[PDB]
Symmetry: D2
Subunit: 279 residues, 4 copies
Amino acid sequence: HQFVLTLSCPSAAGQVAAVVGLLDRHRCYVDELTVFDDDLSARFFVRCVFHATLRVDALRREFEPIAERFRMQWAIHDVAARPKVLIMVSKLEHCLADLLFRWKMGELKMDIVGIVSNHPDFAPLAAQHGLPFRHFPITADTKAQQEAQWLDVFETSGAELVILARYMQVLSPEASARLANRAINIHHSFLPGFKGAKPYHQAHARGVKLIGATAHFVTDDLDEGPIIEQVVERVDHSYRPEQLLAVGRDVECITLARAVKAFIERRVFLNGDRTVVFQ
Amino acid sequence: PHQFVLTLSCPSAAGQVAAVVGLLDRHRCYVDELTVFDDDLSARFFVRCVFHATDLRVDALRREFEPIAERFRMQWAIHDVAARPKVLIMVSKLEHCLADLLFRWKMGELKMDIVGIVSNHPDFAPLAAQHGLPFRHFPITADTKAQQEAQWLDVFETSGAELVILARYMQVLSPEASARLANRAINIHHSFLPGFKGAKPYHQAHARGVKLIGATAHFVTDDLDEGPIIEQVVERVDHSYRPEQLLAVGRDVECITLARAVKAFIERRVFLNGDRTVVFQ
Amino acid sequence: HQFVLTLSCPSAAGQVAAVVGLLDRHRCYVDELTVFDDDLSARFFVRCVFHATLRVDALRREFEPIAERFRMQWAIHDVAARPKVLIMVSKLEHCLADLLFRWKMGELKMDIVGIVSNHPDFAPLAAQHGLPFRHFPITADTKAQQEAQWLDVFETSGAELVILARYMQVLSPEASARLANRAINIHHSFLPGFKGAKPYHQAHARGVKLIGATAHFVTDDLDEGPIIEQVVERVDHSYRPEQLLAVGRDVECITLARAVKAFIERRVFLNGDRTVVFQ
Amino acid sequence: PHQFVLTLSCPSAAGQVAAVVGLLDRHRCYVDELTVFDDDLSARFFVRCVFHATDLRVDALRREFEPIAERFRMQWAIHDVAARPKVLIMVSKLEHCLADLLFRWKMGELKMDIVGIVSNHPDFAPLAAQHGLPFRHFPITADTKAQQEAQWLDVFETSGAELVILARYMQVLSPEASARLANRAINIHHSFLPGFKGAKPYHQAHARGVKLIGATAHFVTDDLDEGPIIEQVVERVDHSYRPEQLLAVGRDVECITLARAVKAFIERRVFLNGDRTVVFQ
């Protein structure tokens, strides 16, 4: 019966001794351990998976004063608990279908509390998987009201993460602030970047040899919130624009799944405007 | 078998390959490799064909190719595969690409004849000397940009080089110089996802927490670092890499990316296709 | 409206001229061309995707004397035709489920004429995809007869390919000969090779840093038939035997899918005991 | 910051990290890196910790580590990160791994001191000279296998090298030679999937139509080309690669694989774990 401790704090003497000292005090066998010290942000990170050899509740309570002393933000999760997630989607199926398959097959150990959309298109996909589907359409005069609707479902469902599986509506500053660091977005990426209409036609025109994607945390910042994962795939001159699009969508699937997996396995930490991701 | 390679590009139309293989069959040439690509968006057609004589009057073959090139409006060439293409390498104060190229050359991976190394600095004169290669230092001052280009462009012409490699040569070629070296000069630079402009891009990459570091090799044009892409390569990095460690990765990726591009050029596998390239494997 | 011509023959002068000359004679625009000449087996290979600008039927008819002249094995397939495939499975779901997903999502453009198994485990899965499922159990005294049962299904179904999605019964020499070069198998692979009991425990013990898989054509040879694809994934010392197993199964999925796609897109040719695979 | 790296392995038990960090805190050392791994199947525990002084009596730190090592039955070492490990490189007639290591060394990627290059052949004497490295040629005859090993084992001892790198050294080390170099010699060889035994393995790989070519770097034992694996790498190939082209790829992968193993060793990231290894990133 395992548990995973994660924590970050300002780097300071005695932090490791305090943490391992506690684990030892409560006779915890350490199944996994990973530590990282960022001398530039002056921040320390720990992920520890362990199990007892009554003891875990005592460890949790005694962790409080250590956390206060070092100003640590931390969490201890039951590894058997499946994090609750809400998946948002529009009219593009690929990321949603990919996540549901990885979930079906046991790769992503999470509880999908629901699938929410501005379109009705994937009601049957949600049904084929026994998952609740909520359709909240948007009109010109109801953008703030529609957001409140799905943000309400987010709160009442107990979800701790919102996965934007190619949800195509721009989130308001207030939505983004409210979901800051508890929502993961996915989009395509190019080297060099292409902005504006028909980016895959631009990428074809420029004859790029790589197509990519980036998964990041949603924040209420001027630019994209913190990067979690980036992946690229090699292409060549024989790829028409529609074939580049196909590669991009595939890379979005892998990229999103990696990000989501790292979040639900407690391997992703915020480090200012960037992330720490443990393998 | 003594091999030759025919490369050609021309406007899209029917019957080119038939005409080419017909001529080759008549000269009793065995086709070892044949790659064809039609780009229906740019309406351009590309062929690379490696062949050898089965029993070869190569001059008579070229002569008989003319009616074909004229009919189909082809740009073309037949090279002797044994010939080592002549190349001129430009460098400034950064050693890494120049050193990587010299290593691959010395070990026989890059089969080219380096007619000279040219630089705005004297730093790598000893490196050149150690490899038995001519080195020329042509310094630049605010006033002598045009004069200094004329100097190395002179070396380029008199040496017989058919390719100039900018191995992190950190001076911008004039529009005059780019035009004279059109389709005959390859540049390398670092590439980021997302892009970073201005000073200290590796520090920006670090602060942005990128998980990839890349590089792009391209043919040189007037549009600074943005000519036709030949090759792009990236390497995975993570949160533990400080700016100077990302810099080390970028320089490594520049090396591999440039070497790949130069190799495709000397193996006659890269063709211009407007603002992009066709690179056969 | 596209067609794909594939052919292999003993390498001889005039072979390209004959093929391109015929394509030009019938005003066929070439969408894709790939040729390869193997000077060691002295064998020539061509894959050509084209469309007419009545003409294709005449081309097919006139291809016969050229094929006879050069001793070519060849085929012209309608690209819109979905090759018919039969999938065999036992109690391991992973490859079958991966193929069904890729099929469902339109990546593998094939008609699955049926799923056949020695166990009943994946009947519900088959029903969920609207596919025919046949359970043919095996007992000590009926191994020859059970093979006949699914071989009959294979013949009557019109399938041109049998995909062994971790079908765990050894095929008889007669079955192997009958399915020669029309069936694809998948198995795990290691560097170095591990034979016998618990190969993932052996891989863990030896501390390998890579886990792989190989997809190959079934033949009636002593060793496995021609290799179509091999893939490896990196692992490390922290991977327990059960985690190595998980990576291996994942790689089997990717490897099989690549081989199957290459077969249904007419990109794989036999070249004696090896294969030519066009990208 | 002047860094040190502590490495240790010991039987699994509770309390080691606490004791280690406690000591480091007592000497006001800042922990820069800490990697821990317990292998519950071999019942071995491994730690690598990089640290530096903040306000360092290193010999008092070592002295105070003794009670900890004794109690927990640890094999351990504290190395100065600035120190360049001393290495001896063995080579025969194949240049590729030696040349690759020498380039990575010259360019600053492999921070080690090469105390010498030893060979059963004279071929690479000039390669050593050019890098200012001592070269020793120790030829072998039918009746002198034991005498010749004694010659280069003597160089190993007197040179103060802590690592022998077998850069395609093609003589089988004796059981005595292997024993003296236990945990201190790295070998490289090609690896295939499936495995090929005997003459002309690349021709065999070609005939089998393999789509990958690999290499394995390992510690040396009595067991020929078998020993604790440090690193494995593979490169994709296809039907168009002739046997000699497969060989060229295999040699390239041998270079990369060996270089990664050597770098892991000199960075103190590789631990023995019975018949396998632990390699921290």
